[PDB]
Design a binder for this molecule. Structure first.
Ligand SMILES: [Zn+2]
Ligand SMILES: [Zn+2]
Ligand SMILES: [Zn+2]
Lengths: 148, 154, 157
């Protein structure tokens, strides 16, 4: 009954010459996300939500973004926590994300050793507003529930 | 003891020539949303907690089953789907971010609409109001955002 | 087993001539956050998440941007928030949060922020978390026009 919640945020710029990788899925696109890692904004947001729920700090303190997510899960477990569920949203004007959501969920559940029914990924546009609306970047946000 | 959490986001442009409807409430104002940003966010948080995908998967602008549906009917159908999936709703919290108009006078009405649609006691539904301190498109009154969190249990 | 969750958001402009106070920490810097109170964006977001979890409205309902709160210490506001949440019958189980800022560097101050929040909520450190982010050079955040914070809280009645 010792439940905890975590919340995470990430954003990266969309630039020429990078592959677009979100939720571990390589999505055909003219630009990709800019970062030191592969810049997987969704996995990063979920990673931060998991560190937050476990009160283990953040991705900046601790560190392929799937390997990092798998290591995050290891650290959460090390602290005595079990992951109960993850929910998330990706915000991008383009490209279309719906065809790729199922693969992302499958990847996240594998990396977190969760059944598919405890993992969720939602897709949003930003209604043409802000840097998101202009296609300058992609945001992700996440929530995680854990228990010790 | 099988609890789950969900989170939701929505945003729309604020322009003259549309009514302003938030949380099922029509608010007198010179501009409107181009589109109930609060109900959408809550709807998405509930689907998320149940791991049922999102509002786009359930209620396609394509689908004829829901053409013209009010954001409240969609919220009600969301809740029915959440229950059949085996989940009971424990609470909802949310924030509306808008530079104008003032939203405090309307909060109890929004809470009442949401609690009704989700068949929840009023004290398990919360709506919070923020400005964006004149920063960004929110700050310029070009759009309004909402965010939501939901706790459920199977 | 009567758990509830809350979520919070805040933002303030970054301006010359103001103290920069985040998570109760006074951070040396040429600019500070603008607000009616001390404009502690992180404590405000956490305060809203707590009121939200307890279904008690928001920081605007409880602490109106009244001369009673000009210059107000946002740690005193957070403690009063916690007092009201407890009066409503709720116990706090944990808090998580994120600060998004182009500058200054926040990592050196995070542990102090966590300690302040934990003291104010009468929680052990291992139930309080503060994460620091940049906005990867995007938007008004990327231009340093303001600082955002967001929070999540779990409580139980
Ligand atoms: Zn990232
Ligand atoms: Zn919407
Ligand atoms: Zn504030």
């Amino acid at each position: 009954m010792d439940f905890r919640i975590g919340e995470g945020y990430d954003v990266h710029q969309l630039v020429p010459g990078r592959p677009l990788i979100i939720g571990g899925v390589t999505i055909p696109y003219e630009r990709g996300l800019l970062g030191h890692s592969d810049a997987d904004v969704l996995l990063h947001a979920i990673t931060d939500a998991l560190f937050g729920a476990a009160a283990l700090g953040d991705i900046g303190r601790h560190f392929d973004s799937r390997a990092l997510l798998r290591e995050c899960a290891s650290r959460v477990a090390q602290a005595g926590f079990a992951i109960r569920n993850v929910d998330s949203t990706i915000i991008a004007q383009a490209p279309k994300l719906a065809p790729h959501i199922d693969a992302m969920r499958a990847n996240i559940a594998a990396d977190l050793d969760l059944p598919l029914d405890r993992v969720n990924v939602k897709a949003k546009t930003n209604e043409k507003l802000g840097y998101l609306g202009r296609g300058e970047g992609i945001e992700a946000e996440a929530a995680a529930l854990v228990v010790r």
